[PDB]
């Protein structure tokens, strides 16, 4: 099916294990970013918050890629 | 004639929720069944 392959965001500043520890830490502790960056390790909490913002979660369920949606 | 934009938006919300729940339950079953591979179980 049209599944969201979330672990393909492995851009060189991050890694697949880093994204996995990020997701498991946010599921462990809700939005306490100091504990989340502690669980991930080797990264500031601002990078964790930024990479959590920039995840393409719902873009594969919306209509367009970027004609137009119209009204 | 051709005016309903509103029902289109509401059923668009409905269909987006449907496809999102389809992918969520697909990954949930592929992780919950271990008859699926770990590269789509732990993935």
């Amino acid at each position: 099916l049209k599944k969201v392959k979330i672990l393909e965001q492995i851009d060189e500043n991050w890694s697949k294990e880093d994204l996995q520890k990020l997701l498991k830490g946010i599921q462990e502790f809700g939005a306490d970013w100091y504990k989340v960056a502690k669980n991930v390790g080797n990264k500031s909490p601002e990078q964790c918050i930024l990479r959590f913002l920039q995840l393409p979660i719902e873009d594969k369920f919306l209509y367009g890629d970027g004609n137009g949606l119209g009204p | 004639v051709g005016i309903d934009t509103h029902t289109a938006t509401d059923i668009y919300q409905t269909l987006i929720a449907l496809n999102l729940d389809t992918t969520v339950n697909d990954c949930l079953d592929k992780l919950l069944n271990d008859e699926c591979t770990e590269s789509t179980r732990e993935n």
């Binding site: 498991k24 599921q27 | 949930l28 919950l32």
Partner: peptide, 15 residues
């Protein structure tokens, strides 16, 4: 309560 589900319930939510 079945042990097929007890190993996965704490897996899907670590709380």
């Amino acid at each position: 309560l079945s042990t097929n589900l007890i190993s996965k319930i704490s897996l899907l939510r670590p709380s």
